[PDB]
C-alpha cells in the first residue's frame, strides 16, 4: 500500500512526554498487548536514536476480563501539521456511539512520521530500560488517523446516507456518534445494522440530547424569611447580577437594616416582594447573547456537592455558561472520573470538541486513579484547582 504523507506544523518536532508510573499489573497487560501488536506489525520495537515519547496506559473495559491499551497522543495532536460538525444529534432523541479505531490499523502510516508515535512500556523500579515501540500504521487516539482515513471513511458511509439523510452519524477521532430520533427498541436495530455496514470492509445504553438544558437559577420560595435567609438571598442575587444586571436588591437589603438576630423572621414588604418577583422573572430564562464561539476554548468546572452529587458548568466566558447539569451516584474519584466522561461526551455531541476540565482534586491523586474507571477512547485536557469553590452554594 501507499502511505499518506504527514508533516509537523513547519517549525515543530515530536513529543517528549513523561510516562506516569504504572502498577505491575498494568505493565504486564501492556507488554502482552504490544508484542502481539508487534507480531502483527502494527508496532515494532524501536531504537535509541528516537528521542520522542508518548504516554500509554492500560485500561480494562468492564464486562470482560480484557485489558485495552490507551495511548495519550494529546501532545502529538497539538503539533501535527494543521490538517483540514452536524447539528442535529444534539436534537435527536436517543444517540449511540461506537468505536471505529480498528479501521485505522489497516493503513500504512507515513514512513518519515512513525518516529513521532514512539511510546514506552515502563519497568517497575526502572531495573529494566523500558520497552520501546513505534507505529507502522494509523494509531488510535491520534488526530491524524481520522483526517487521513476520512477519504475512505465517508467512501464507506454512502451506502446508508447517500439518499438516507434521515438519521445522523458524526465521527470524532475514534468515535462514531449515531443519532436517530426514532423508536426506542427501534433504535438499537438501525445502528446494529451500521455495525454490519462497515464490517463489510474490515472493522469487525443511549444518550438523550434533546433532553438537556442550561438549567435556570432558582430563588427559594418561602412562607417566612429569616435574617439569615435574606442575607443568603441577597448574596446569591448579587452573584447572579453579574450575569443579569437587571437584578435588583435594594428593597431586600432594606430588610437587612438594623441588627436583628440571624434566626429572626422578617416580614417581606410589598416593595421587597415585588423586587423578588421581578428578580424571579429575569432569571426564568438563560442570559441573552450567549453563543458558542469556535475561536474560544470550551471550559468545564465541576463542584463536589456531597451525597455523590457533582454539579458542572461548560462555558467559554466565565459566567456565560453554554450548559449546566449534575452527575449523581463508589467514591469521590470514581464519580469525578465518570462525570468527566459524561461531560466530555455531551461536549463532543453539542460542539464536537472536548473541553478543558478544572478538576477539584489533588493532581497526584488523579493521575494515580483516573485510569481505574476510564472507559473512553480519548482523554480531555485537564488541570487541578486547589481553591475552594466560594460559589458552591450559588452554583
Judged by CB under 8 A, the stretch of 97-105, 138-146, 275-283, 331-339 that binds other proteins is 331-339
Give the nearer residue to other proteins in terms of CB position, either 106 or 341: 341
Residue from 12, 87, 124, 274 that binds other proteins (CB under 8 A)? Answer: 124
Q: Is residue 335 involved in binding other proteins (CB under 8 A)?
A: yes
Q: Is residue 154 involved in binding other proteins (CB under 8 A)?
A: no
8 Å CB contact between 143 and 83: yes
Q: Is residue 10 involved in binding other proteins (CB under 8 A)?
A: no
Judged by CB under 8 A, the stretch of 23-31, 75-83, 315-323, 345-353 that binds other proteins is 23-31
Q: Is residue 369 involved in binding other proteins (CB under 8 A)?
A: yes
What is the nearest approach in angstroms of other proteins to the Cβ of residue 81? 17
The rounded Cα 202 to chain-centroid distance in angstroms is 29
Judged by CB under 8 A, the stretch of 48-56, 60-68, 141-149, 188-196 that binds other proteins is 48-56
Q: Is residue 17 involved in binding other proteins (CB under 8 A)?
A: no
Report angle CA 123, 129, 134 to the nearest 5 degrees: 90
Q: Is residue 60 involved in binding other proteins (CB under 8 A)?
A: no
Q: Is residue 362 involved in binding other proteins (CB under 8 A)?
A: yes
Report angle CA 302, 79, 294 to the nearest 5 degrees: 50
Q: Is residue 234 involved in binding other proteins (CB under 8 A)?
A: yes
DSSP-assigned letters across all residues of 226-255:
BHHHHHHHHHHHHHHTTT-TT---HHHHHH
User: Grid coordinates in use for 333?
Assistant: 474519584
As annotated, the binding site for Mg(2+) includes 99, 174-175
Q: Is residue 364 involved in binding other proteins (CB under 8 A)?
A: yes
What is the nearest approach in angstroms of other proteins to the Cβ of residue 390? 6
Give the nearer residue to other proteins in terms of CB position, either 164 or 331: 331
| Residue linked to cell 480531555 | 380
Q: State the virtual CA torsion across 198, 202, 206, 208 in degrees, nearest 10.
A: -50
> How far is CA 246 from each of CA 249, 285, 296, rounded to the nearest angstrom?
10, 13, 27
What is the nearest approach in angstroms of other proteins to the Cβ of residue 273? 21
| Residue linked to cell 466560594 | 390
8 Å CB contact between 183 and 197: no
Q: Is residue 231 involved in binding other proteins (CB under 8 A)?
A: yes
Q: Collapsing DSSP states into helix, strand and coil, what is residue 363? A: helix
Residue from 260, 296, 326, 329 that binds other proteins (CB under 8 A)? Answer: 260
How is residue 392 annotated by DSSP? Answer: T
Judged by CB under 8 A, the stretch of 44-52, 91-99, 273-281, 373-381 that binds other proteins is 44-52
Q: Please list every residue from 194 through 223 that binds other proteins, using CB under 8 A.
A: none
Q: Is residue 332 involved in binding other proteins (CB under 8 A)?
A: yes
The rounded Cα 158 to chain-centroid distance in angstroms is 29
Give the nearer residue to other proteins in terms of CB position, either 179 or 360: 360
DSSP-assigned letters across all residues of 283-348:
HTSPPSS----TTS--EEEEEEEETTEEEEEEEEETTEEEEEEEEE---HHHHHHHHHHHHHHHHH
Closest CA to 229 of 383, 393, 101: 393
Q: Residue numbers of the site for other proteins (CB under 8 A)?
A: 21-25, 27, 47-51, 53, 120, 122-127, 129-130, 132, 226-228, 231, 234-235, 238, 253, 256, 259-264, 303-304, 306, 331-333, 335-336, 360-362, 364-365, 368-369, 386, 388-390, 392
Amino acid at each position: 500500500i501507499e502511505t499518506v504523507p504527514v508533516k509537523l506544523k513547519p517549525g515543530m518536532d515530536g513529543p517528549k512526554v513523561k510516562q506516569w508510573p504504572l502498577t505491575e499489573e498494568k505493565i504486564k497487560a501492556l507488554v502482552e498487548i504490544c508484542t502481539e501488536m508487534e507480531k502483527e506489525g502494527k508496532i515494532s520495537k524501536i531504537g535509541p536514536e528516537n528521542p520522542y515519547n508518548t504516554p500509554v496506559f492500560a485500561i480494562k473495559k468492564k464486562d470482560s476480563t480484557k485489558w485495552r491499551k490507551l495511548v495519550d497522543f494529546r501532545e502529538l495532536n497539538k503539533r501535527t501539521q494543521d490538517f483540514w460538525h452536524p447539528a442535529g444529534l444534539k436534537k435527536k432523541k436517543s444517540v449511540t456511539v461506537l468505536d471505529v479505531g480498528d479501521a485505522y490499523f489497516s493503513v500504512p502510516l507515513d514512513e518519515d512520521f512513525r518516529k513521532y508515535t514512539a511510546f514506552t512500556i515502563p519497568s517497575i523500579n526502572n531495573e529494566t530500560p523500558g520497552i520501546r515501540y513505534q507505529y507502522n500504521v494509523l494509531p488510535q487516539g491520534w488526530k491524524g488517523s481520522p483526517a487521513i482515513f476520512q477519504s475512505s471513511m465517508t467512501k464507506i458511509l454512502e451506502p446508508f446516507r447517500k439518499q438516507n439523510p434521515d438519521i445522523v452519524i458524526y465521527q470524532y477521532m475514534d468515535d462514531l456518534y449515531v443519532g436517530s430520533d426514532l423508536e426506542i427498541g427501534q433504535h438499537r436495530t438501525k445502528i446494529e445494522e451500521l455495525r454490519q455496514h462497515l464490517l463489510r470492509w474490515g472493522l469487525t445504553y443511549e444518550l438523550h440530547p434533546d433532553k438537556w438544558t442550561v438549567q435556570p437559577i432558582v430563588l427559594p420560595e418561602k412562607d417566612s424569611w429569616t435574617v439569615n435567609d435574606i442575607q443568603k438571598l441577597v448574596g446569591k442575587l448579587n452573584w447572579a447580577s453579574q450575569i443579569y444586571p437587571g437584578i435588583k436588591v435594594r428593597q431586600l437589603c432594606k430588610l437587612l437594616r438594623g441588627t436583628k438576630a440571624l434566626t429572626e423572621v422578617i416580614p417581606l414588604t410589598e416593595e421587597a416582594e415585588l423586587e423578588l418577583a421581578e428578580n424571579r422573572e429575569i432569571l426564568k430564562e438563560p442570559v441573552h447573547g450567549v453563543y458558542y464561539d469556535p475561536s474560544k476554548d470550551l471550559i468545564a468546572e465541576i463542584q463536589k456537592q456531597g451525597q455523590g452529587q457533582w454539579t458542572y458548568q461548560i462555558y467559554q466566558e466565565p459566567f456565560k455558561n453554554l450548559k449546566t447539569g449534575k452527575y449523581a451516584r463508589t467514591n469521590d474519584v470514581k464519580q469525578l472520573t465518570e462525570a468527566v466522561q459524561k461531560i466530555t461526551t455531551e461536549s463532543i455531541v453539542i460542539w464536537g470538541k472536548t473541553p478543558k476540565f478544572k478538576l477539584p482534586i489533588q493532581k497526584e491523586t488523579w493521575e494515580t486513579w483516573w485510569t481505574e474507571y476510564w472507559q473512553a477512547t480519548w482523554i480531555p485536557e485537564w488541570e487541578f484547582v486547589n481553591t475552594p469553590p466560594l460559589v458552591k452554594l450559588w452554583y
